[PDB]
Nucleic acid binder design. Structure first.
Ligand SMILES: [Zn+2]
Lengths: 94, 49, 76, 177, 83, 117, 141
RNA sequence: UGUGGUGGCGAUAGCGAGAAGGAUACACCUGUUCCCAUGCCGAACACAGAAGUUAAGCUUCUUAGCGCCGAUUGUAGUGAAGGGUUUCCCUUUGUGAGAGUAGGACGUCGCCACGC
RNA sequence: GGCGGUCGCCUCCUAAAAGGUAACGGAGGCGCCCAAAGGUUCCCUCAGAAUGGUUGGAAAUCAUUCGAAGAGUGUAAAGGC
RNA sequence: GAUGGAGGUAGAGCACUGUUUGGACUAGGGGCCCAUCGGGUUACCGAAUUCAGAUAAACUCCGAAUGCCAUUCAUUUAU
């Protein structure tokens, strides 16, 4: 609703190996409103709404302005740690 | 049952060609119109004997 | 006491002349076993499906839509 | 022949009524007739087609073909190339002549008759009429025919469903039950 | 229609003890008896005994035999004896 | 029962035939077309695909009926209009048919009147 | 020495494997499942003993699927045979399990039964196991 | 304009489901005497014509159920450089798929004849 | 070392996406056949399954429909068609 | 360094060959039918049939990094 959504890099080098040892999830969003831009996220932020609301409620992205009503499609997480990786989002309208 | 066989010119007497047949499928000497080199003209060729 | 260890020799297939090369008349191009690269402009196929060139010139490999590929020689 | 007359003079308007075709072209016709005399004994004795084909030539007006084996089966003792069956196709006016024979002389020579089975629909209407014997047709004699072979008549139409074909054949004989 | 490989055939008149249904053809021939205009100048040797009316089926089922009265057996043979 | 749409099979035989030679560089192609009633022809080239001369069974100028008459007439017209632009090495595209006169008479009419096969 | 599972082979001597890594294969049907977290083979028997030691401390059945099965074959020589001649006879079976995979899954009983059984089982396998439940979706179905 | 014929371009052109048509054109159909034909059969093929009809083919249109073409991301894997146990793992640096998916798409281009 | 097995040729894998590459490594064949199973010019499209139909059988010949290949290719296996 | 290409490897994927675990179902068979025609009953299951989920060296609808082959190409070097 007012979230931790920012920018990223195109094909960044092994900077990713450390992104999994220091608590980071490389996330994605491609859809209707705006075309396609890789976007931040970590594990503690969204579980708040998850526990409060559930598992499918309208998720909104922000630059502290208008929102991107993502409907996160698929995230088969990296096993053996029970934590999120490759959160493939999705965005539709009303 | 197969046999290497030599055709031969029926006119100039030259053993011009070589090939093979099955001596119990075709028990008769072959008759093919090959081409002789000694006279440069097609010629009835018959199996050797 | 095994019944294995029987082998044939190699036959050394594989393309023998890249693209952009200047090929003289007669040369081999891509030795096959059955059709894997259909022939094209000025390229002729032999007995054992090998692919030779008829005219001097340059080679280029391209594709026939979705089926297969081609070779051809565009002389200067 | 009389059928073609009766056909184009009665069948077409009646059927055009009972279904209301947008065009008379939409009519369900009769196309052909094939006949199937399976000896099934040449593999045992090839001296049976020698008369089967004859009796056929007498029933139809033309000498049949001779169907091959097409495969190999041991329980049957079938080798490819062996002949088992012999067929004829009927077209043109001979279609109508022979069907007239069937409806008018042939069929009512069969003992204990109720008619033809009401069920050969195929969901597309190519009705068949199996036969047990072959002593039926007057083209066949007592002391000349010495077996009880049969045929498999395969009539074809241009109908799509089976009721059209049924009530058509009704107009053209076919003494159902 | 090819040649020399097709047997005899002529538009032989069909007939019966009735109905003179003299129009069809066949492949059995012989002594000429009906060379007429209204039909083919042909033979009535076909004297089949079925008019397509003998078997009362195309003439519709008749009462040719009955073969109906089993009940009166007890009800008439000793049933005339009853009343 | 269905009936195989007859133009399709002739199309298929055509496509097999055409695979041998078009070669319509400067020895350009011939052609042929049947119908229930008429006959047409064009002299075509590749890669342009742009014809050079045409004719018509019953569309420009003829005498007789849908037969050799019409056929030979059309062939004469074709060969006459052809040599106008100077063509003497046509490659005859059988189409998808045989040689029995609606095509064969057209052929030999095209031959004598000044075209070389 | 009881045969839990086998196959119909089409091949006898298979080249020994090479196990590298894995991630995925989350819960499928049940509500509670294991998760091996190492890299090792697993013989036929080990799975059989695991299934027994799950059934017994369970009761009334309860849904239990064995979400892995031996495929690949085994071999061995005999002691007293110098190295050399062709491969030895085949005896046994094995299906390698990388970390992250999920071996067993159960549902139909409250957790206490579930964790009872799924800790009884994990003492028959040479893998450092773990425990996870059927978690969450966009639609649980 | 329409209709017929004839070519290229990766099925983004297809498959499927539904509607319209006949002036010309195409086709269905009317026939076998005639060149020609059936391992039997004018069904096929070939020939002779115009009684009858858009039912079908056939061309125009509608449709995202199916088939196809799909970006930007993430993740697997890897060259070079290193560090731990050396069965395997981990870190910088360069590259980065397959799956998933927004979306596109019920064609585009060229020629010849006919007449409206 | 012996006793066993093998010694020439062809096809697949091992083989690390050019070519080449060992093992008493893992799998199969060869020491011919064909006068048409060749040459050429015409024409045709399969295995099945469902549905019907005497002898007729679950499985012979027939007929209709669905079917991009699930067939066939003298011979072993790849690559093709 | 730039451009062009050949090929099925590491992935990963079930379209083909194998191997395979659950759900449904009926294809009707499974000892009787339950019986001296209403449904074959309990039960077995493969295909016809499907919904999920797995795996391969001699499985592939797909597929990199690298090397390899070339160029009237460019820059240093010297074979
Ligand atoms: Zn001589």
């Amino acid at each position: 609703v007012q979230l931790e959504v920012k920018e990223r890099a195109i094909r960044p080098r092994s900077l990713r190996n450390q992104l999994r040892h220091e608590g980071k999830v490389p996330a994605i969003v491609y859809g209707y409103q705006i075309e396609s831009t890789p976007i931040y996220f970590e594990e503690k932020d969204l579980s708040k709404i998850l526990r409060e609301h559930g598992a499918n409620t309208v998720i909104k992205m922000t630059v502290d302005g208008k929102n991107i009503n993502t409907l996160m499609s698929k995230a088969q997480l990296d096993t053996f740690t029970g934590q999120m990786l490759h959160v493939e989002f999705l965005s539709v309208n009303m | 049952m197969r046999v290497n066989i030599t055709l031969e010119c029926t006119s100039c007497k030259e053993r011009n060609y070589l090939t093979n047949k099955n001596k119990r499928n075709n028990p008769d000497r072959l008759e093919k119109q090959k081409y002789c080199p000694r006279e440069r003209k097609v010629t009835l060729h018959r199996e050797t004997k | 006491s095994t019944s294995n260890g029987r082998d044939s020799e190699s036959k050394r297939l594989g393309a023998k002349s890249a693209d952009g090369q200047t090929v003289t008349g007669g040369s081999i191009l891509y030795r096959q076993r059955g059709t894997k690269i259909y022939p094209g402009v000025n390229v002729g196929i032999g007995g054992d499906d090998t692919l030779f060139a008829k005219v001097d010139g340059v080679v280029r490999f391209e594709r026939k839509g979705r089926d297969k590929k081609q070779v051809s020689v565009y002389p200067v | 022949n009389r059928l073609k007359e009766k056909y184009i003079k009665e069948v077409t308007p009646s059927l055009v009524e009972k279904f209301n075709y947008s065009s008379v072209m939409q009519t369900p016709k009769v196309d052909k007739i094939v006949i199937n005399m399976g000896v099934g004994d040449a593999v045992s004795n090839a001296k049976n087609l020698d008369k089967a084909v004859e009796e056929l030539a007498l029933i139809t007006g033309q000498k049949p073909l001779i169907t091959k084996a097409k495969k190999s089966i041991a329980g049957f003792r079938l080798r490819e190339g062996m002949p088992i069956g012999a067929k004829v196709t009927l077209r043109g006016e001979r279609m109508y002549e022979f069907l007239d024979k069937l409806v008018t002389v042939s069929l009512p020579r069969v003992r204990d008759f109720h008619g033809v089975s009401k069920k050969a629909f195929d969901g597309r209407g190519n009705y068949t009429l199996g036969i047990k014997e072959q002593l039926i047709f007057p083209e066949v004699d007592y002391d000349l025919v010495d077996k009880v072979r049969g045929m498999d008549i395969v009539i074809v139409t241009t109908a799509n469903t089976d009721e059209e074909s049924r009530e058509l054949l009704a107009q053209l004989g076919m003494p159902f039950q | 229609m090819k040649q020399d490989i097709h047997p005899n055939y002529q538009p032989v008149v069909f007939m019966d003890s009735t109905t003179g249904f003299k129009f069809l053809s066949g492949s059995t021939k012989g002594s000429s008896e009906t060379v007429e205009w209204e039909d083919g100048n042909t033979y009535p040797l076909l004297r089949v005994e079925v008019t397509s009316d003998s078997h009362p089926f195309y003439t519709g089922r008749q009462k040719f035999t009955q073969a109906d009265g089993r009940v009166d057996r007890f009800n008439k043979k000793y049933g005339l004896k009853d009343e | 029962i269905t009936k195989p749409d007859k133009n399709k099979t002739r199309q298929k035989r055509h496509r097999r035939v055409r695979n041998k030679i078009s070669g319509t560089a400067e020895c350009p192609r011939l052609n042929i077309f049947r119908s229930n009633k008429n006959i047409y022809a064009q002299v075509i080239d590749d890669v342009a695909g742009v014809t050079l001369a045409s004719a018509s069974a019953l569309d420009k100028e003829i005498s007789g009926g849908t037969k050799t008459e019409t056929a030979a007439a059309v062939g004469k017209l074709v060969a006459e209009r052809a040599a106008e632009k100077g063509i003497k090495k046509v490659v005859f595209d059988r189409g998808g048919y045989l040689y029995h006169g609606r095509v064969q008479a057209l052929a030999e009419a095209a031959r004598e009147n000044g075209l070389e096969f | 020495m009881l045969v839990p599972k086998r196959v119909k082979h089409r091949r006898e001597f298979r080249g020994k494997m090479r196990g590298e890594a894995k991630g995925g294969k989350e819960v499928a049907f049940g509500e509670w499942g294991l998760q091996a977290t190492e890299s090792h083979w697993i013989t036929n028997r080990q799975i059989e003993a695991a299934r027994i030691a799950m059934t017994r401390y369970m009761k009334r059945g309860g849904k239990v699927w064995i979400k892995i099965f031996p495929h690949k074959s085994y071999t061995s020589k005999a002691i007293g045979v110098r190295m050399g001649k062709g491969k030895g006879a085949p005896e046994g079976w094995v299906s390698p399990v990388k970390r992250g995979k999920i071996m067993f899954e159960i549902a139909g009983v409250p957790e206490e039964v579930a964790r009872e059984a799924l800790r009884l089982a994990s003492h028959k396998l040479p893998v450092k196991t773990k425990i996870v439940k059927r978690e969450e979706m966009g639609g649980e179905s």
